[PDB]
Structure formats: C-alpha cells, structure tokens
Design a protein around this ligand. Structure first.
Ligand SMILES: Nc1ncnc2c1ncn2[C@@H]1O[C@H](COP(=O)(O)OP(=O)(O)O)[C@@H](O)[C@H]1O
Ligand SMILES: Nc1ncnc2c1ncn2[C@@H]1O[C@H](COP(=O)(O)OP(=O)(O)O)[C@@H](O)[C@H]1O
Lengths: 364, 364
C-alpha cells in the first residue's frame, strides 16, 4: 500500500462544486505533494468541497502562499466564479478616495441606511482554516494594538468574546454587533472555528458608525455604516479607517495581505479583489411587485436580499441592495456602481408611483 | 513574534475536561514540538478538549504511535478515567474463550437479548481523526477482503454507504444496522468525519447475529448479538469472528493494533483494554422502582441505560445493562462479570415479585 495521489483522489460524483470540475486527477497528482511554508496542502484547500455535496465553491486558502503554490487550481476556480478572470488579468489598484464619488447622496425617503464592508488579512499569519492559537492571538494583538492608536471619531473600545460581561453581551446583541461561532459548512469543514472564542473580539467606535470583527471568518472584518443615504460619508469613514489602521500597523512592521493581480487576499476566493460589499436599505413598494424587478437588479450588476441579510425575507418592501461583484473594479468604483444603480431603481419606483411605465428606464 | 509553546498554550478556564487538569504549561512545552511518524501533534490529540467546555475527556489519538509519543499525557488521563492505572500496570492478555464461561444462560423471562461489542484498529494506518482518504480506503480494503474469506454462519455481504440503494438502505434502517454521519463533539472536533461517506460501509451475516461497521468511529466495529439470554453463544460467535478475521488478515500481513500494557488500541482512551461492552436487555418491573436500584447496579460494576442506547428512556422497564469498565479485566472476565451481575439483579427482581426484601442480596 502507498499513500499516493491515486489512492487519495477525491470521489466528486454527485457533487455540485466548482472544484470537482477543475481538479481532475491529472492536476491532483501534480499538486498532491506540494506544501506552502506553513504546511497548507492541496487536500486542505479542497476539503470543504469534498465534504459538501451542495453547490458550493469548496475552495479555501489556509494562508497567503496558498494562492501561489496552488495557483493553477485557484485560478481555474477564480476564473469561473468571477465570470472571467485569466492569468494575465489584473485587479485595479485600490481606490479609497471618497471625494472622487459623484452624487453620493441618496433620497433618504427611500434609502434608510448605508453599509460598506471588506476584509483584511495580516501578512505573515495564517488564515483561520490553518492558523494556530499562537497565530490567532498575534492577529488579535496586532489589530487591537493598532485600533488603540485611533483617535477622533474613530476612537472606540474592544470587547473580547472571552471576557465579555452579560451586560456588554446584551448591549452588543441589541446593536447587532455580536457574532456567534460560525456554523456554516465552509467554516466548519475548513476547521476555521477552532478554540472558540480564544482571541476573538469586537471593536466599535463611540458613534457606532465603524465596526471591526477580529478572527471571525477573516483576520479583520471592517464595517462602515450610517442611517440615511449619505453613502459618500460612509465610504469616507471606511477608507479613512482602513488607512489609519494600516498606518498604526506599519509602526510594528505589519501590513495587509495584497498583491498586484488579486488585490486584497482573504481565505475565500469568492471575496477577492476588493472583498467589498457596499449596500443600502432601500424601500421599493411598487418596483418590488414588478415582474422585471429581479432582472433589472441583475442588469444593474447589483444583488438583492432580505433586510436581515443573506437568506432572509424583505420586510415592508425594504431591500438590501449591493454590488454583486468583488473583482475587476476598484472600491471607489463599486461604490459608484451602487450609487448609479440605486438611483435608477429609485427613478423607476417614482415612475410606478405616478402610474407611469418604466419600460424605457430598463438597461437595454 | 514566535509560534512557540507559550503562545499556543490552551486557555482551559471554564473547561470541565480531564486534560485541562493534567496538561499544565510545563508538560505542554515538552510535548509541543513532538510528532509521530504520521505527523500527529499534541495540539491534534487535545483539540476536542479545547473546543468543548462540557465534562468531556477531550483526548483522542490520531494514530497508534500517539500513545507512545504523548505517553505522559495519555497515561495521566487514562489513570484518572479508568479509576487507577499506573505506568507499570498492565492489561491482562486477551481472553476470548467462551467455553471458560460459567452459567452463560440467562432466564429469558427477563433477559430479552444479548449484545457484545468491541473495536479494532488496522496496524499501519491512522485513526479517523488523522487518516487520509488513501488510508481510510486501505482500511476498508483490508477489512472487506478479510470478511469475504469468512464462511459458514459467518458468511455475509457488504453494504458500502456510497453505493447503497434505497431498498438496501431501507432494510438496514429497519434492522437498525445503519449508521449516519456522526455529529458528536469528539467526532466532529477531531475531524473524524471527513469525506463522508467515502470508504464507509456495513457488513452483516445472513443470520444477522454478527455485524461489522467500517470506518465509523473506529476502523472496525464488531458486534455480536442474539435474541434471548444465551450470552455464552453470543461471546462464542464474537471471539470466533474476531479470530477468523485476524486469520484472513495475516494472509496479507495485517494485524490488529495491540500492545502488552494497553491491550487493543483505539482512538478513544475511554475504550482501551478490551473496548468491550457486553450488554443485555433485561426487564425489571419491580427492581427499577426500588430506591437502591441505581446503587446496586454501580456496586455490581455494571452500567444502566435506556432501551434505545445511551441517553434514552427505558420502555416497559426494560434496561440495557452492561459492564461499566473496559480496562483491568479480560474479555471473557467482563462477560462473566455481566453474567454474575445480571443474575443477581434477576434474583432481586424475583424477591420483590414475591413481596420479599432484597436487603441481604445487596453487595455488602
Ligand atoms: N445597507 C445596510 N444597512 C443596514 N444594515 C445592513 C445593510 N446591509 C446589510 N446589513 C446588515 O448586515 C447583516 C449581515 O448581512 P449579510 O447579508 O451577511 O452581508 P455581509 O455578510 O456582507 O455582512 C445583516 O443582518 C443585515 O441586516
Ligand atoms: N443487549 C442488547 N440487545 C439489543 N440491543 C442492544 C443491546 N445493547 C445495546 N443495544 C442497542 O445498541 C445501540 C447502541 O447502543 P449504545 O448505548 O450506543 O452502546 P454502544 O455505543 O456500545 O453500541 C442502541 O440503539 C441499543 O438499542
């Protein structure tokens, strides 16, 4: 008996994962014995895809180096997932300049709130699927040390999950800032929830307009938010926050994971490039009952979902609309995509309100 | 930053695991960098204990070598779990001689069925927490190849979970021979359910008196059973089955995992020595309503539980009574422990049936 590639090749029958359609034995044999500097193997990065029979992606990176050592597998998946992204295609340079936005104010009669999120990795340390307790703790240390250097309207306080009081936990729940131990297949099967809640925590400023999660699904989850429809102001704080944290991190020789081709790196290939989801809560009483509604959203390159997030129902016809893509455009440009898209949606709503047709407002 | 033992030491506060009370930093530092020939680390074997806050054991072996490379941790836990087992204590030689049993027939008026189970590991291959798809498949191959050499009343057929038909699956469910993907903390947290159901299967003889599970929680789970109370006959088939399989395995240079001190090795320290649980279904209408019932069972060194197994209620006063221990006695002697114990229970029941006292039947 030999523990070789042939003996270890996954049985992808019945699976609906992207990986199974790209990881033929030819490729597996090649990648089988490879390892990153942190010991991440091909079996590691595909484990979730094997465990799950649903329509997953199944691909997860244990560390930054995963994207280079297992480049041909990630590129194949990335290419299909992000609807076209070859080996010579490159992510545009980061763009966090809020002042370059045009008309970043929404009619607050329809737009109730604005939210912009992204994820960062701390270079040198493994992603949650592979990180050790030591690494995870260093991630928390780096981040919290940096956050404590923030001032002004970015001044905040840190709430470690492992030292959280009933009173604090209760208030964070009411704020909807608390996160539980993940239970999703990708997180569970990738061993991303080990040692919970060791070195996990929540940070937020006094205004509660800037939220930070540590060691949840990414090293750092960044969230900027405001009531109303001033998306430009939400983006301005978003970029100013990321930059400020990065500046405090340089003091300790730490930086975000980023490279010319893929932009900001994270464990989940689906969230590469900008990892940015800009969204609004927008009320669309009439448009939502229009037969072309779902097609209009897709055409605008937006995504639609319930008020309570992914896989929830929309209450009082208020929808969570956001940019659908993550790659092939800069942050500032995705935010401009949301602006243009949402205003069009609002124009259509105001047409239906006046008993008019929207037939010639639809993206041809 | 250094990824050393100090940075990686588990925070055992709040935990009710045995490991936390033995794995002080002193020990952790020593074991931290160690590895078995299969790459099993200390972090691996204790991971479940860290993940779980309940009253677990939390210790699991990735391979056979785990018990030697991490000997001082396993010995500490084993010592406490099995109520006294020092470094110089030794498990008695295996004893599968059913003919050495005395009075192995139960009053079938009270004893409805008999069951005896154990677990085996195939030497050379890793336990479910650490095994690869290749290894797991080799385990299935070795076992099924051996089973196909069995004849007579040990002739049976193999039902691979990954090629199971609705009709077969339905019949196995009715027989209560099917096992699902484990969901318990120890199994989930130790990564023992990877690639389900790849290389998992069920084997049983025509009589349905001999059952075998492959790659569930152990490499091989062996179960002998009969209606009525002829425990001697159930043990006779049990031992004859284990020996026959071992004999077919030698043809291919394979053998069970076993050593002088710990007896038959398995991933779970709680099941070392004999890994043997001999049980009966015994109806105790009157005794079960006696205030001393639970104390009598413990004194007889037996265990009591519901008819549907662990954590179930007893229906019609029928209890699952079995030997409580796994170490410090031979198989044949645990079965004799069940015999002596159950007959005493039956004598007490027949006393209460006649309105007599059992005060002087109780183990002083
Ligand atoms: N524009 C918005 N305003 C207020 N809350 C929002 C907005 N967009 C999303 N949320 C909230 O964020 C939470 C997470 O949503 P989810 O669909 O998981 O997106 P993501 O995972 O990108 O945060 C949800 O409970 C939702 O209510
Ligand atoms: N003496 C017996 N006769 C018939 N069935 C039994 C007997 N003992 C246990 N069982 C059955 O075996 C199943 C597993 O029981 P469990 O408590 O998990 O013990 P184990 O894990 O050692 O098999 C249960 O559903 C139970 O009904």
């Amino acid at each position: 008996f030999q523990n070789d590639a042939k003996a270890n090749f996954p049985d992808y029958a019945n699976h609906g994962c992207v990986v199974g359609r790209h990881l033929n034995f030819e490729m597996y044999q090649r990648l089988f014995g490879k390892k990153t500097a942190h010991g991440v193997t091909v079996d590691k990065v595909i484990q979730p895809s094997v465990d799950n029979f649903g329509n997953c992606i199944g691909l997860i990176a244990g560390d930054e180096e995963s994207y280079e050592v297992f480049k041909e597998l990630f590129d194949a998946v990335i290419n299909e997932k992000h609807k076209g992204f070859g080996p010579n295609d490159s992510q545009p340079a980061p763009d966090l300049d809020a002042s370059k936005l045009v008309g970043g104010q929404f009619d607050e009669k329809y737009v109730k709130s604005c939210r912009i999120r992204t994820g960062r990795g701390i270079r040198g340390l493994c992603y949650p699927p592979s990180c050790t307790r030591g690494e995870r703790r260093e991630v928390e240390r780096v981040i919290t040390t940096a956050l404590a250097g923030l001032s002004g309207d970015l001044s905040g306080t840190y709430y470690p999950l492992s030292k959280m009081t009933p009173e604090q936990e209760n208030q964070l729940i009411a704020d909807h800032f608390l996160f539980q131990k993940p239970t999703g297949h990708l997180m569970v099967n990738s061993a991303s929830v080990r040692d919970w809640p060791d070195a996990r925590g929540i940070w937020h400023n006094n205004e509660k307009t800037f939220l930070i999660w540590i060691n949840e699904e990414d090293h750092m989850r960044v969230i900027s938010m405001q009531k109303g429809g001033n998306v430009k102001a939400v983006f301005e704080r978003f970029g100013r926050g990321l930059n400020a944290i990065a500046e405090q991190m340089k003091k300790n020789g730490r930086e975000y994971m980023w490279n010319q081709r893929l932009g900001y790196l994270c464990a989940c290939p689906s969230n590469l490039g900008t990892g940015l989801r800009a969204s609004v809560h927008v009320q669309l009483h009439q448009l939502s009952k229009h037969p072309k509604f779902e097609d209009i959203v897709v055409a605008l390159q937006l995504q639609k979902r319930g008020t309570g997030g992914e896989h929830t129902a929309a209450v009082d016809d208020v929808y969570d609309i956001s940019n659908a893509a993550r790659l092939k455009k800069s942050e500032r440009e995705f935010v401009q995509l949301l602006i243009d898209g949402v205003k069009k949606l609002i124009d259509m709503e105001q047409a239906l309100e006046a008993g008019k047709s929207i037939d010639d407002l639809i993206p041809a």
